[PDB]
């Protein structure tokens, strides 16, 4: 792809994080802790899942960023509405304000309702995310496989400001402790 020139510097918003998450001092990395991280509860924190939002809000333009997923077994990535539900159980779908892909149990799927199978020959170590607000497009790229397209959500109805969206996943296996990292420009 040729989206690299729309690169934006994303930082994570501590106040939105599930209380188990550890965000690095530079606000560029997040991982699962082995316990509650000794923060107060608030209405913004994701309660049920190890999720966090980026601080940046997008309402126009073209935006691109990259995330490192090396050696993780499970994760969700993409964008969401600023007003997505934070508490209780919910599915990742455009109807609920999320435009995401994920890895789970050795298969990759797009967060449509119902979910769509992805066809990935080279397991990605880094994912590129491209948003065109005006066009209503969210696209995902395999940086490990020379930038090959993973999935395009088109005809998106954002219906609000967008935030970068992250889920580090559960670590019940002991094989998913690795962080999500925002990669340098
Ligand atoms: C080993 C592991 O993944 N433990 C879960 C427990 N439960 C839980 C609930 C919300 C957010 C994160 C978590 C972590």
UniProtKB/Swiss-Prot annotation:
Induction data: Up-regulated by IFN.
Domain of life, per lineage: Eukaryota
Domain (B30.2/SPRY) ranges: 8-185
Keywords: Cell cycle, Coiled coil, Cytoplasm, Cytoplasmic vesicle, DNA-binding, Metal-binding, Nucleus, Ribonucleoprotein, RNA-binding, Transferase, Ubl conjugation, Ubl conjugation pathway, Zinc, Zinc-finger
Compartment(s) where it occurs, according to its Swiss-Prot or TrEMBL record: Cytoplasm; Cytoplasmic vesicle, Autophagosome; Nucleus; Cytoplasm, P-body
Single Gene Ontology MF annotation: RNA binding
Main subcellular localisation: cytoplasm
Keyword Isomerase: no
Gene Ontology biological-process annotations: negative regulation of innate immune response; negative regulation of NF-kappaB transcription factor activity; negative regulation of protein deubiquitination; positive regulation of autophagy; positive regulation of cell cycle; positive regulation of protein binding; protein autoubiquitination; protein destabilization
Cellular component GO terms held in the UniProt record: autophagosome; cytoplasm; cytoplasmic stress granule; cytoplasmic vesicle; nucleus; P-body; ribonucleoprotein complex
Modification note: Autoubiquitinated; does not lead to its proteasomal degradation. Deubiquitinated by USP4; leading to its stabilization. Autoubiquitinated.
Signal peptide (UniProt feature, chain positions): none
Keyword flag Cytoplasm: yes
Entry remark concerning the domains of this protein: The coiled-coil is necessary for the cytoplasmic localization. The RING-type zinc finger is necessary for ubiquitination and for the IRF3-driven interferon beta promoter activity. Interacts with SKP2 and CUL1 in a RING finger-independent manner. The RING-type zinc finger is necessary for ubiquitination of NMI.
Described function: E3 ubiquitin-protein ligase whose activity is dependent on E2 enzymes, UBE2D1, UBE2D2, UBE2E1 and UBE2E2. Forms a ubiquitin ligase complex in cooperation with the E2 UBE2D2 that is used not only for the ubiquitination of USP4 and IKBKB but also for its self-ubiquitination. Component of cullin-RING-based SCF (SKP1-CUL1-F-box protein) E3 ubiquitin-protein ligase complexes such as SCF(SKP2)-like complexes. A TRIM21-containing SCF(SKP2)-like complex is shown to mediate ubiquitination of CDKN1B ('Thr-187' phosphorylated-form), thereby promoting its degradation by the proteasome.
The family this protein is said to belong to: Belongs to the TRIM/RBCC family.
Subunit and partners: Homotrimer. Component of a SCF(SKP2)-like complex containing CUL1, SKP1, TRIM21 and SKP2. Interacts with CALR, CUL1, FBXW11, HSPA5, IKBKB, IRF3, SKP1 and VCP. Interacts with SKP2; the interaction with SKP2 does not depend on an intact F-box domain. Interacts (via N-terminus and C-terminus) with DCP2 (via N-terminus and C-terminus). Interacts (via C-terminus) with IRF8 (via C-terminus). Interacts with ULK1, BECN1 and with ATG8 family members, including GABARAP, GABARAPL1, GABARAPL2 and MAP1LC3C/LC3C. Interacts with TRIM21 and SQSTM1/sequestosome 1. Interacts with IRF3.
Descriptive protein name: E3 ubiquitin-protein ligase TRIM21
Organism taxonomic ancestry: Eukaryota, Metazoa, Chordata, Craniata, Vertebrata
Gene label: Trim21
Range of the intact protein held here: 291 to 468 of 470
């Amino acid at each position: 792809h040729h989206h690299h020139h729309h690169m934006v510097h994303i930082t994570l918003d501590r106040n939105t994080a599930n209380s188990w998450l550890i965000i690095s001092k530079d606000r560029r990395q997040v991982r699962m802790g082995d316990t509650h991280q000794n923060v107060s509860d608030n209405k913004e924190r994701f309660s049920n899942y190890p999720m966090v939002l980026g601080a940046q809000r997008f309402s126009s333009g073209k935006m691109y960023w990259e995330v490192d997923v090396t050696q993780k077994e499970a994760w969700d990535l993409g964008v969401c509405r600023d007003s997505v539900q934070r508490k209780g159980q919910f599915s990742l779908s455009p109807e609920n304000g999320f435009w995401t892909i994920w890895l789970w149990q050795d298969s990759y799927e797009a967060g449509t309702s119902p979910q769509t199978t992805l066809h990935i020959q080279v397991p990605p170590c880094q994912i590129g995310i491209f948003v065109d607000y005006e066009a209503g497009v969210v696209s995902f790229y395999n940086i490990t496989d020379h930038g090959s397209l993973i999935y395009t959500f088109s005809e998106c109805v954002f219906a609000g400001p967008l935030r970068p969206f992250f889920n580090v996943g559960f670590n019940y296996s002991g094989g998913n402790a690795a962080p999500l990292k925002l990669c340098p420009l």
